[PDB]
Amino acid sequence: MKNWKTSAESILTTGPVVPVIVVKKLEHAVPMAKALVAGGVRVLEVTLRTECAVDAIRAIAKEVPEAIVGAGTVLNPQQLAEVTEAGAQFAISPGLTEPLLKAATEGTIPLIPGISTVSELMLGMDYGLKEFKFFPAEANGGVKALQAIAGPFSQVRFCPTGGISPANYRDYLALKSVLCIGGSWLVPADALEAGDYDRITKLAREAVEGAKL
Amino acid sequence: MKNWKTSAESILTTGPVVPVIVVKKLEHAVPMAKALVAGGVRVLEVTLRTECAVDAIRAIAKEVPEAIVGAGTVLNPQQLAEVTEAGAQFAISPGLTEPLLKAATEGTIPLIPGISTVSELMLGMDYGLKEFKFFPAEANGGVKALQAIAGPFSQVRFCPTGGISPANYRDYLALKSVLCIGGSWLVPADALEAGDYDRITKLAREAVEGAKL
């Protein structure tokens, strides 16, 4: 993608699972990141759903070089600019709009936007993108929906997210159109609100092993 | 929003139910509006699906000032201008497009447009909107679908419509992201056609009563 030195494809094929992270207390950012890395998970999506989000991204970026940190829930060019300055390596949006696609295209980091319909995918393809997030996965119609929607597009790859759990992420990873999935079970709130990092690491390891066929 | 004296939020917080009205005979418009008001329902969405629709809005605005009358099935700038001229206090659309959104934001009355996906939600948000219609609610996957779609957006509120009835409207009204719902059961075509306003008033009163949470 001309202006992106790091391809969206490389972000999505780094591992089978990209954790959708919600960090409430900035102090838990780094240890949580190092914990995930300890469990074999290197691409971390920090969602812009909390006050400390961007700060969390900046911290992880400077302190956990063994992890590729990025931003999630990026809804517009303003937020894209913010996470880019904070050090995010990639951006994930739950959906897409032309202003976001355009600023991302002209930007320096890869954006992996979510889509729910073929028209949304085609719009994204008009901007040169080939990797997308399928969100909300289950609500969109699960594996069947993704299969139909991926049908007429052989070169497109997806990262299904939304309703994905240890019980069904294998069903998605099995699809040839899928590169990886997104899950929020790796960094449970309760576990993060207790400093139980050993628990996080184990969830990552299980997530990675549970993905290997 | 800057140019709207009456906020979209105000429209949706007025009551738990917004009747989606289809009036075929102009002469029924006023007594219908009075009957609904009598039942405790005053946010009246007159859909642009019949020739007398615009005249209906005008008649109601004039003869039943106590009701907050507006337009539905507004598909483009032209129609939006036409109903605004006719006295509609708000506008509802089953979906959205940039031309409609831009014209609405430039206009004087709130537009509460329908979306089905996150990308459509984001487009509306690009124009500053925060209140939306979720249509067709049931066909889009119902409550589950909406919760998934509303997940990444805490400040957004909805008015789901499409397949909602006394049987399930409390399922929607129970959600934190839902302010109210739209339904067509308060004004059955036969009742309206038969000038049976007692029935309409009863339906409205039962609707308001059953929505209590």
Added chain:
Amino acid sequence: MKNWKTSAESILTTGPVVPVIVVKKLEHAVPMAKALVAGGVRVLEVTLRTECAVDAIRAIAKEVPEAIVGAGTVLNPQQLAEVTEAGAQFAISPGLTEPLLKAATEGTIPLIPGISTVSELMLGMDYGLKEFKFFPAEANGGVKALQAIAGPFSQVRFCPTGGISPANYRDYLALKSVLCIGGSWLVPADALEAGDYDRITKLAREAVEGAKL
């Protein structure tokens, strides 16, 4: 549209079933085509999902004059221009984009674009289209979705495709808003390579006979 001698309506109203074709081997096109027509199916959608696609359209348009040959999976003004020159009589897309919609109205052949949501349908209507593909049918919310849409748009007509087979195509065909159905069951891959045109004619024949309501 102003520049379509053969309306989209004409295409969709020709027969009850429109086979979505994927031709891997040129030279399989004509025999397959003739096989379909012999069964009573004249409208053939050749999807741009293979290298020989464009060649198959030209080959079928030359050796089978009665068949109404068209292109499928047309995604951008480039593929549209290509198929048009190759002799496609119409174009079908999985979804729609403004660039594609614009080039279509400027072109010479009718475009029947797919839509999944009311917002996408409205975009298409902003370009004057009245006929649309409903894809992916099942995932979109199947029959009930379509009916929900008929409310605000009673003049729009659809050709639903995706998850439709003899077990359910009648459920769609029964709807007033439906002109015809799209399906792939008329030409089973195995049957093609096996050179079993008889099977194709029987499937096509049963398709038409089964549609009679």
